[PDB]
Amino acid sequence: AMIEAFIFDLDGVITDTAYYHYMAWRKLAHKVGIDIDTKFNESLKGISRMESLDRILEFGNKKYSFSEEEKVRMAEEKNNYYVSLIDEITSNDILPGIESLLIDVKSNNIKIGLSSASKNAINVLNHLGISDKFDFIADAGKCKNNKPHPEIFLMSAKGLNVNPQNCIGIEDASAGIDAINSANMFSVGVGNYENLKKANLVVDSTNQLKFEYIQEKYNEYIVRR
Ligand code: NA
Ligand code: NA
């Protein structure tokens, strides 16, 4: 019952991008009479670009009032602004304990994957300086279903050519945790316990993501699954 892989989400596990997306979406949203707050945005978190835009427009009952071309234009302006913000990310922005985890996973001959809904995930990993640590990066551009649908996590399992039942999925949002469990994987949640209650394991912060602790908990889950 050995682990075949650790599949990570990007935002809130490898590094923090949620605030940058929010700053970028907030600017475009104001231009259509919609002012999103860090509470509403918490439902745009880990969501793909065009879906995220539709939810923002929805919030103002104008999701169906724009043509997709016009939505394409709006998305572009937002993307350019988001890309400008993340281009200042460095290795110092890697969440605490992640590098050490990435190393230990690799020393235990276990694959590593990233299942992020962002087509900017590659750009971010290169700025962090750890793109070489990832065996497979799911292409959000080919994913047709956002979390909590398990597609993005199944894509990394397919990509790495491993059994999802032997995979560990790490995430900080409830939608992602639902996607991980729906992919029949061991789910590890990072953050608030109440919001991440459906996770198989919940830790407080990325510093709590220790390899031996994750493995001991994984073995427990497998025996009881
Ligand atoms: Na996340
Ligand atoms: Na599970």
Automatic annotation (TrEMBL):
One of its GO terms (biological process) is carbohydrate metabolic process. The record marks 116, 147 as: Important for catalytic activity and assists the phosphoryl transfer reaction to Asp8 by balancing charge and orienting the reacting groups. It catalyses: beta-D-glucose 1-phosphate = beta-D-glucose 6-phosphate. Its cofactor is Mg(2+). Gene3D superfamilies: HAD superfamily/HAD-like, Putative phosphatase, domain 2. The keyword Isomerase applies. The gene is pgmB. InterPro entries: B-phosphoglucomutase_hydrolase (IPR010976), Beta-PGM (IPR010972), Beta-PGM-like (IPR051600), HAD-like_sf (IPR036412), HAD-SF_hydro_IA (IPR006439), HAD_sf (IPR023214), PGP-like_dom2 (IPR023198). Belongs to the HAD-like hydrolase superfamily. CbbY/CbbZ/Gph/YieH family. Transmembrane segments: none annotated. GO terms for cellular component: cytoplasm. It comes from the Bacteria. Substrate binds at residues 9-11, 25, 44-49, 52, 78, 116-120, 147. Mg(2+) binds at residues 9, 11, 171-172. Binds 2 magnesium ions per subunit. The active site is at residues 9, 11. It holds the Pfam family Hydrolase. This is Beta-phosphoglucomutase. The keyword Acetylation does not apply. It comes from Clostridioides difficile (strain 630) (Peptoclostridium difficile). Its EC number is 5.4.2.6. One of its GO terms (molecular function) is beta-phosphoglucomutase activity. It is found in: Cytoplasm. Keywords: Carbohydrate metabolism, Cytoplasm, Isomerase, Magnesium, Metal-binding, Phosphoprotein. Its main location: cytoplasm. SUPFAM superfamilies: HAD-like (SSF56784). NCBIfam families: bPGM (TIGR01990), HAD-SF-IA-v3 (TIGR01509), PGMB-YQAB-SF (TIGR02009).
